[PDB]
Design a protein around this ligand. Structure first.
Ligand code: MZS
Length: 218
């Protein structure tokens, strides 16, 4: 049973990436999986199922939809937008949102209203996560972990400055873990990276990803 998110939940998964990126001392246990979900939502359900079946994997495709979950947090009833994921519980998703809202309020207290580039909903959050995945893929092509961190601190210096939760060591470990545990994600990531690196222009981060991905050959 593999979750195959479609184009419709790409905005949601990007926001989930962003919520972890704004979290001070964020727990990156699920970042490898969330990053992979973002890549699949970019490829689309159709292409994702095609890649897995072509790679010889047998797949039970799980539809990914946005649902509203009502949960009581500190006496107050709260509405949370969650994704129907077999790989990621409602509880985990909500706790990611709770912890990021705590970090966000601390940011308001520090600098007032937050600039677009410092928010959890900045359009490049998913790609920022996938830049670490691109570095891990190079070193798999866990000894190369120190080199991933050192290459990450230089290439993602502006992004690390923007996001308190951009912790290269934790994110790289999460990707190493997911690629070891679920090797079918390597095939998904590689097809994602080939397709992405063909797109012209776009954002600074889309450009950094393309350069990092191209480096896995030369
Ligand atoms: O500027 C604000 O007061 C603002 C904006 C949003 C939103 O875009 O939903 N939110 C909700 C929100 C804030 C932080 C967070 F990590 C998750 C959700 N707060």
């Amino acid at each position: 049973s593999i979750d195959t998110p479609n184009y419709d939940v790409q905005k949601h998964i990007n926001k989930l990436c962003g919520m972890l990126l704004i979290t001070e001392d964020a727990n990156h246990k699920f970042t490898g999986l969330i990053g992979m979900l973002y890549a699949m939502s970019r490829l689309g359900r159709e292409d994702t199922i095609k890649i897995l079946r072509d790679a010889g994997y047998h797949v039970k495709a799980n539809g990914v939809d946005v649902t509203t979950h009502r949960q009581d947090i500190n006496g107050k009833e709260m509405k949370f937008e969650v994704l129907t994921l077999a790989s990621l519980t409602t509880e985990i998703q909500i706790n990611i949102e709770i912890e990021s809202r705590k970090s966000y309020k601390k940011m308001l207290k520090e600098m007032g209203e937050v600039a677009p580039e410092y928010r959890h909903d900045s359009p490049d959050c998913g790609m920022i996560i996938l830049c670490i995945a691109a570095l891990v893929i190079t070193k798999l092509a866990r000894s190369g972990l120190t080199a991933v961190i050192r290459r990450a601190n230089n290439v993602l210096k502006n992004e690390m400055k923007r996001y308190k939760g951009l912790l290269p060591k934790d994110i790289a470990n999460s990707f190493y873990e997911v690629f070891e545990k679920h090797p079918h994600f390597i095939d998904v990531f590689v097809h994602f990276g080939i397709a992405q690196s063909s797109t012209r222009g776009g954002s600074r981060v889309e450009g950094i990803f393309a350069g990092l991905f191209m480096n896995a050959y030369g």
